[PDB]
Write an enzyme that holds these catalytic residues in place. Structure first.
Site, PDB file in Angstrom:
ATOM      1  N   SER A   1      -0.426  -6.030   3.344  1.00  0.00           N
ATOM      2  CA  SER A   1       0.780  -6.160   4.211  1.00  0.00           C
ATOM      3  C   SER A   1       0.586  -7.249   5.270  1.00  0.00           C
ATOM      4  O   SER A   1       0.244  -8.384   4.891  1.00  0.00           O
ATOM      5  CB  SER A   1       1.168  -4.849   4.855  1.00  0.00           C
ATOM      6  OG  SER A   1       0.574  -3.748   4.188  1.00  0.00           O
TER       7      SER A   1
ATOM      8  N   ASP B   1       8.099  -4.499  -4.626  1.00  0.00           N
ATOM      9  CA  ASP B   1       7.612  -4.423  -3.220  1.00  0.00           C
ATOM     10  C   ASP B   1       8.541  -5.154  -2.240  1.00  0.00           C
ATOM     11  O   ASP B   1       8.678  -6.356  -2.366  1.00  0.00           O
ATOM     12  CB  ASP B   1       6.240  -5.077  -3.120  1.00  0.00           C
ATOM     13  CG  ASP B   1       5.428  -4.551  -1.960  1.00  0.00           C
ATOM     14  OD1 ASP B   1       5.957  -4.495  -0.837  1.00  0.00           O
ATOM     15  OD2 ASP B   1       4.281  -4.194  -2.200  1.00  0.00           O
TER      16      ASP B   1
ATOM     17  N   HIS C   1       4.821  -0.609  -2.510  1.00  0.00           N
ATOM     18  CA  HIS C   1       3.935  -1.188  -1.515  1.00  0.00           C
ATOM     19  C   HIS C   1       2.585  -0.493  -1.457  1.00  0.00           C
ATOM     20  O   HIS C   1       1.672  -1.008  -0.805  1.00  0.00           O
ATOM     21  CB  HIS C   1       4.590  -1.141  -0.141  1.00  0.00           C
ATOM     22  CG  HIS C   1       3.989  -2.096   0.834  1.00  0.00           C
ATOM     23  ND1 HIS C   1       3.537  -3.340   0.464  1.00  0.00           N
ATOM     24  CD2 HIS C   1       3.748  -1.985   2.160  1.00  0.00           C
ATOM     25  CE1 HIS C   1       3.051  -3.961   1.522  1.00  0.00           C
ATOM     26  NE2 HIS C   1       3.169  -3.160   2.565  1.00  0.00           N
TER      27      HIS C   1
END
Lengths: 611, 512
Positions: free
Chosen positions: A123, A187, A310
């Site tokens: 991330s 994602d 994710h």
């Protein structure tokens, strides 16, 4: 496997990078991991809107221009425009760098151990990782480029970081092969920074807290993010094919579009395929078109899967081995690959358009190389070197003065050759500006050599032309408003090529040298007098001379001393010929012998001219 | 030829916030029933409501004496005409007073309307963009199912001025209002033809008219399809969620043909129906017609590059002539004598004249973009060519003339290219030194005229009245010459001692 050959990273390094990114959740701002000869610097992700958009940043995408001293290479070499990155990510990186931490000391200790440096991240940590790698590249690799000092960057679902200039600078320096950004198909994080701040201000914190390891809010966030993504992708593909120039130009004042673009190799991942893409525009189009819904059932399911994907990178890195890999830019039948990845026929058209534009760039470069290889073209430069210059210095006046004043048949054909060469180089420049040539064309050694040769040979002729037609009486000084753009471009390419190993900016080097000259005036008025001076480039020598031969001495004392100081190194480098400027009929000598005897004595050029 | 952009341009327009914001403003204006001005996301929207009237189809020329003036659209020879009812309603609503004062301070303005309100919004955007000076903000117009506003001359005048891209007209393939106006009415600006499946843009008036014809002959008929614009905007604005494959058939392997097939299916017709084939041909023709001027301009740029050595030759010839010891000027060196240098400069002049004849004839025939001569590159090219070469052409003409029947150069003997270049240059202090070249290109032709006039004035000494009148027509020439030389806007070759100007000067002063 083919993946290792294409990307340079094997499954072991990827697994270790993923493990490091996992343990980076806990440790503050980074986590160093040792394994054999490989040291991995994982970075801690953060899930607050203050960490994706900067609260004090009054832009609608949270972007900021890089400083051309901290990351000197990240720019357009010819144009001079610096790159743009997310401000929050840059601030996080600068907090991690700060000497009050052990990151820089650990990195130096790992470089000294001949270890393989790997920056990895998940991330927001993946975005920081990208930045860190560029930092490393700007600080260690460019200074002493060795195979050992080659870094690796592995991001897992990282958001976009930089604009198009960022990716262009990565590709010009041939650094884009170092970066690998794993993206799972649905994602949302890789596409979030394609939206505006105002579009997601109300719903960002809830979704971010849901990403940290109401369905209305998730659906609304996904819808707004994908709406801005669709707008950006449509405008990008419409612009890179040169379609609807005026229509796009008129809407552009009404359109507020995200600048962030993919950087480095992306790897889109499904349950069965693993598609690697190196084309930034192809990746942007794929980002839009690989997450559209096939039908209503899948549409109901997309907002869930957009968040549970994710956290699918654990399974991704575990099951990478048993996935059929292929390279999109390499193979030509991209239909089956994109269909399996869920791209529609229109999306396939636009991805194919991006790839074909890349191929058009490559073929344009081939045409340019073929043109500058033709003997007809080389003969012009050869004739200017071998027949024009020796004859004009046998006449005891220099080819600058011969071109500017006399009307020999030789002068006319020199003017004709000058015009034709200027045509070729303006054409290549026009291709560069339209982004029609590959990224590393400005970094090519053959092009840099040939362009430097052409500039040093012919720019004096262009200045002689500019002054023979008396432009300086109406258009102003040549170095201010008369200099051709291709000459600045060539100068900037050569300066970057030579000075980039020492990590210095050419104008900074010029300022250091003039400060070392120890002029009689302090910093402010010397900087003010050396505005648009012809002493920043050797090939513009004559231009500066034409600005100095009509003025009283005390007005131009600092400029004359700067010219004196630069002449020695200009002669040594070959930027300024010495057999030409010191001849009896030369304009420079005739003006110089008129200087006061005090300056003529204390100048460093007594030994070249007699009165 | 290679890439289909019609469907892409429509997708670009549909994906913007302007689309839905404009429709929302139109809906609010229709509900309220009056003109609304609104601000969304920093963009100002002027929504003009659909106004019911009785008359539509009568054209009247643009008003030259009124509060609503149009300096921009008055060039087209057939006076650009607009619908009379639209202008009357413009005056009745007092949009000028209620608008120019309320938009002060705004920077982005979008003007939009439904049905009649659309035709009014297009008219008002044209007024804002057609003033003597560009407005303080940028104006974009979006209309929804508006009837056509003006005649073909108005459309050509808009397109020639580069204002056609400030207009977007969303049109449903079933909305009969824009397809049914009188044949004297012509469209302008980009048209967005939409249906349930997608949209397609067309930015060429002829191709839009052909599309209108095809839709009239083939497609169905209904009236509620005009009140379906709300559904159309909403449905079009939410296709980014859905993957849209080519449903039915297999796309051609070619990229351009696949693009055309996708556009045809976006308009809703199959690629196997007569409607589909007609639409596909229309789309291909439109793309070809768009493409051709750019290719021709590129070819002309290449040809201009190939010709530059000729202009360099003429510059060298001028340099050697005014650097020679006879001091005649290149005009006299080219007209009096015939040397090897004169032969070569003749060859270069012939090449230049031929190339620029081709360029001018292509410009007039409208084979090149309307923004061609406005480009400053061709402005410079034509300027330098004319300055260097026109005196040579005058020399050639008076060299190959009959002394009496040949007449003179400006009285109908001048080539059309130089007049068109005069147009181009006009369309876009004292001088410290002499100019590099004479600013008055026809200087030498007027000098030859005055030489004939003075020959006639000395030809007769028993007609004092004719002497006086020839003096009246000789004095403005010498006054013009003095004005030209005092400003030093003439090259030094005009002042050469053996240049024809000097001997004529001496002869005229001894004539007094």
């Amino acid at each position: 496997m083919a993946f290792e050959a294409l990307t340079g990273i094997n499954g072991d390094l990827i697994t270790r990078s993923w493990s490091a990114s996992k343990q980076a959740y806990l440790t503050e701002r980074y986590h160093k991991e040792e394994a054999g000869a490989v040291v991995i610097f994982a970075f801690q992700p953060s899930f607050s809107e203050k960490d994706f958009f900067d609260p004090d940043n009054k832009s609608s995408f949270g972007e900021i221009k890089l400083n051309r001293v901290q990351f000197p290479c990240m720019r357009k070499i010819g144009k001079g425009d610096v790159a743009t990155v997310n401000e929050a990510f840059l601030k996080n990186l600068e907090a991690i760098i700060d000497p009050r931490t052990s990151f820089q000391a650990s990195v130096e200790m790992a470089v000294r151990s001949r270890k393989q440096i790997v920056f990895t991240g998940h991330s927001s940590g993946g975005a920081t990782a990208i930045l860190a790698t560029v930092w490393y590249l700007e600080k260690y690799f460019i200074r002493n480029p060795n195979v050992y000092l080659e870094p690796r960057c592995v991001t897992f679902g990282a958001p976009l970081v930089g604009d198009s200039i960022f990716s262009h600078a990565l590709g010009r320096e041939k650094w884009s092969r170092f970066f690998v950004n794993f993206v799972s198909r649905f994602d949302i994080v890789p596409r979030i920074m394609l939206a505006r701040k105002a579009s997601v201000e109300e719903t960002l914190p809830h979704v971010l807290a849901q990403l940290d390891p109401s369905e209305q809010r998730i659906t609304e966030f996904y819808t707004r993010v994908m709406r801005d993504t669709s707008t950006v992708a449509n405008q990008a593909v419409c612009e890179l094919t040169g379609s609807a120039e005026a229509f796009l130009e008129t809407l552009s004042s009404f359109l507020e579009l995200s600048p962030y673009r993919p950087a480095g190799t992306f790897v889109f991942s499904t349950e069965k395929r693993l598609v690697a893409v190196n084309n930034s525009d192809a990746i942007l189009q794929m980002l839009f078109y690989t997450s559209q819904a096939s039908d209503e059932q899948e549409w109901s399911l997309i907002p869930f899967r957009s968040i549970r994907d994710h956290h699918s990178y654990e399974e991704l890195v575990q099951s990478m081995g048993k996935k059929l890999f292929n390279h999109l830019d390499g193979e030509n039948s991209i239909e089956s690959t994109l269909n399996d990845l869920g791209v529609s026929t229109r999306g396939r058209q636009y991805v194919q358009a991006a790839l074909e534009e890349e191929k058009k760039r490559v073929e344009n470069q081939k045409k340019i190389i073929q043109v500058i290889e033709q003997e007809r073209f080389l003969k012009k430069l050869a004739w200017i070197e071998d027949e024009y210059k020796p004859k004009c210095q046998a006449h005891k006046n220099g080819y600058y003065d011969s071109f500017k004043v006399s009307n020999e048949e030789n002068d006319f054909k020199a003017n004709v050759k000058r015009a034709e060469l200027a045509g070729v180089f303006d054409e290549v420049l026009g291709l560069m500006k339209k982004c029609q040539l590959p990224d590393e064309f400005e970094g090519d050694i053959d092009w840099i050599k040939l362009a430097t040769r052409y500039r040093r040979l012919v720019e004096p002729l262009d200045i002689a032309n500019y002054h023979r037609h008396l432009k300086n009486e109406d258009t102003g000084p040549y170095m201010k408003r008369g200099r051709p753009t291709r000459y600045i471009y060539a100068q900037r390419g050569y300066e970057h090529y030579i000075l980039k190993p020492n990590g210095m900016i050419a104008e900074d080097v010029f300022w250091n040298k003039v400060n070392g000259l120890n002029l009689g005036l302090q910093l402010e008025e010397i900087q003010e007098t050396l505005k648009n001076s012809g002493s920043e480039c050797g090939s513009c020598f004559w231009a500066e001379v034409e600005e100095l031969k009509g003025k009283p001495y005390e007005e131009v004392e600092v400029r004359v001393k700067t010219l004196e100081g630069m002449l020695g190194e200009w002669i040594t480098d070959g930027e300024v010929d010495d057999k030409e400027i010191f001849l009896e009929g030369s304009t420079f000598r005739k003006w110089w012998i008129t200087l006061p005897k005090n300056h003529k004595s204390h100048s460093p050029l007594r030994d070249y001219m007699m009165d | 030829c290679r890439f289909e952009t019609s469907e892409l341009q429509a997708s670009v327009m549909i994906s913007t916030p302007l689309f839905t914001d404009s429709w929302s403003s139109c809906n609010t204006a229709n509900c309220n029933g009056s003109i609304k001005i609104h601000d969304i996301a920093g963009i100002t929207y002027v929504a003009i409501p659909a106004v019911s009237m009785i008359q539509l189809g009568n054209l009247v020329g643009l008003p030259v004496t009124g509060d609503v003036l149009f300096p921009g659209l008055s060039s087209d020879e057939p006076l650009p005409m607009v619908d009379a009812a639209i202008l009357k309603l413009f005056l009745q609503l007092k949009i000028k007073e209620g608008l120019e004062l309320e938009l002060l301070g705004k920077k982005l303005v979008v003007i939009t309307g439904h049905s009649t309100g659309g035709a009014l919004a297009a008219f008002t955007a044209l007024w804002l963009l057609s003033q003597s000076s560009p407005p303080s903000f940028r104006v974009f117009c979006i209309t929804f199912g508006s009837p056509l506003l003006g005649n073909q001359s108005l459309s050509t005048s808009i397109s020639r001025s580069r204002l056609a891209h400030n207009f977007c007209h969303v049109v449903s393939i079933h909305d009969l209002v824009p397809r049914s106006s009188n044949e004297q009415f012509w469209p302008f600006g980009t048209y967005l033809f939409c249906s349930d499946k997608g949209g397609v843009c067309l930015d060429n008036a002829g191709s839009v008219r052909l599309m209108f014809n095809i839709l009239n002959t083939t497609a169905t008929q209904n009236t509620e399809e005009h009140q379906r614009y709300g559904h159309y905007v909403f449905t079009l604005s939410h296709m980014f969620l859905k993957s849209r494959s080519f449903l039915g058939g297999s796309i051609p392997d070619n990229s351009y043909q696949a693009g055309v097939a996708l556009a045809v299916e976006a308009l809703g017709f199959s690629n196997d129906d007569t409607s589909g084939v007609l639409v596909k041909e229309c789309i291909e023709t439109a793309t070809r017609i768009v493409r051709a001027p750019i290719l021709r301009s590129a070819e002309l740029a290449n040809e201009l590059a190939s010709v530059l050595p000729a202009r360099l030759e003429i510059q060298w010839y001028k340099d050697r002539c005014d650097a020679s010891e006879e001091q005649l000027g290149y005009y006299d060196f080219f007209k009096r004598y015939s040397l090897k240098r004169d032969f070569k400069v003749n060859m270069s002049r012939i090449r230049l004249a031929k190339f620029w004849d081709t360029v001018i004839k292509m410009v007039e025939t409208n084979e090149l973009p309307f923004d061609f001569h406005l480009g400053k590159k061709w402005i410079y090219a034509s300027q330098f060519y004319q300055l260097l070469a026109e005196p040579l052409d005058i020399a050639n003409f008076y060299k190959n003339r009959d002394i009496k029947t040949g007449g003179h150069y400006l009285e109908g003997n001048r080539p059309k290219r130089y007049e068109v270049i005069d147009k181009w240059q006009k369309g876009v202090c004292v001088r410290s030194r002499y100019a590099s070249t004479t600013q008055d290109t026809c200087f030498w032709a007027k000098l030859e005229q005055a030489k004939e006039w003075l020959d006639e004035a000395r030809k007769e000494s028993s007609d004092p009245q004719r002497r006086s009148l020839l003096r009246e027509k000789i004095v403005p020439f010498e006054s013009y010459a003095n004005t030209l030389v005092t400003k030093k806007e003439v090259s030094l070759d005009v002042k050469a001692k053996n240049s024809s100007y000097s001997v004529w000067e001496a002869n005229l002063k001894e004539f007094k």
